Curated annotation (Swiss-Prot):
Residue numbers binding a glycoprotein 3: 29-30, 41, 52, 126-130, 165
Role this protein plays: ADP-ribosyltransferase that mediates mono-ADP-ribosylation of glutamate residues on target proteins. In contrast to PARP1 and PARP2, it is not able to mediate poly-ADP-ribosylation. Has been shown to catalyze the mono-ADP-ribosylation of STAT1 at 'Glu-657' and 'Glu-705', thus decreasing STAT1 phosphorylation which negatively regulates pro-inflammatory cytokine production in macrophages in response to IFNG stimulation.
Cell location: Nucleus; Cytoplasm
Entry superkingdom: Eukaryota
Induction of expression: Up-regulated by IFNG in macrophages. Down-regulated by IL4 in macrophages.
All copies of domain Macro, residue ranges: 10-181
Protein's name according to its UniProt entry: Protein mono-ADP-ribosyltransferase PARP14
Phylogenetic lineage: Eukaryota, Metazoa, Chordata, Craniata, Vertebrata
Quaternary context: Interacts with STAT6. Interacts with PARP10. Interacts with PARP9 in IFNG-stimulated macrophages; the interaction prevents PARP14-mediated STAT1 and STAT6 ADP-riboslylation.
Tissue-specificity statement: Expressed in macrophages.
Post-translational events: Auto-ADP-ribosylated.
Family indicated by similarity: Belongs to the ARTD/PARP family.
Span within the parent record: 1208 to 1388 of 1801
């Protein structure tokens, strides 16, 4: 009831509509992207510096690292929202890589509607240090977006892009898109 056709608008980029949202995947360095929100896949202490989290915390800078540790000591958080630091975004949302990926993406979408944001960029959450399987992660990310659209919750959010470090993981996302296509 929601899926459009899969195509390639630019070299190495693949896209399809999911209701009112354009869903895109590409390989590359997420720290070079511009979006209202960039997502970090981190540990339950919000201080992982390995895999994509290393690059995100290094490029964001020490004020963002300090925001993370300040919030982590205040309460038990499922995820935290910080400034963008020196990344090209308005906020970073730091999710726990080992948590249920569908739940994490649903939370990101809801927080972006609360701020009237239009664009999101995320990694293949959980496929690094957490060692969740890439097929299960792709299925969960796309299921979260489908549920958000089905409930009529997409109003401000218009574009969700997954920028993936390993080309072999991109291939798994593309196959999942083709399974769903209208
Ligand atoms: C959430 N997925 C990952 O963390 N995946 C993953 C796997 C292997 C390496 C990297 C990575 C990314 C940027 N910088 C560096 C030094 N390493 C990322
Ligand atoms: Cl991870
Ligand atoms: Cl990734």
């Amino acid at each position: 009831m929601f899926y459009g056709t899969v195509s390639s608008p630019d070299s190495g980029v693949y896209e399809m509509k999911i209701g009112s949202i354009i869903f895109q995947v590409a390989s590359g360095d997420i720290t070079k992207e511009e979006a209202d929100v960039i997502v970090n896949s981190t540990s339950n202490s919000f201080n992982l510096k390995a895999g994509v989290s290393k690059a995100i915390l290094e490029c964001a800078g020490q004020n963002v690292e300090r925001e993370c540790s300040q919030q982590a000591q205040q309460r038990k958080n499922d995820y935290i929202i910080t400034g963008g630091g020196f990344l090209r975004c308005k906020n970073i949302i730091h999710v726990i890589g080992g948590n249920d990926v569908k739940s994490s993406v649903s939370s990101v979408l809801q927080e972006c509607e609360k701020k009237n944001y239009s664009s999101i960029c995320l990694p293949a959450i959980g496929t690094g240090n957490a060692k969740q399987h890439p097929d299960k992660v792709a299925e969960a990310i796309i299921d979260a977006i489908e549920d958000f659209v089905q409930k009529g919750s997409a109003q401000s959010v218009k574009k969700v892009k997954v920028v993936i470090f390993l080309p072999q993981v991109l291939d798994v996302f593309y196959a999942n898109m083709k399974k769903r296509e209208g």
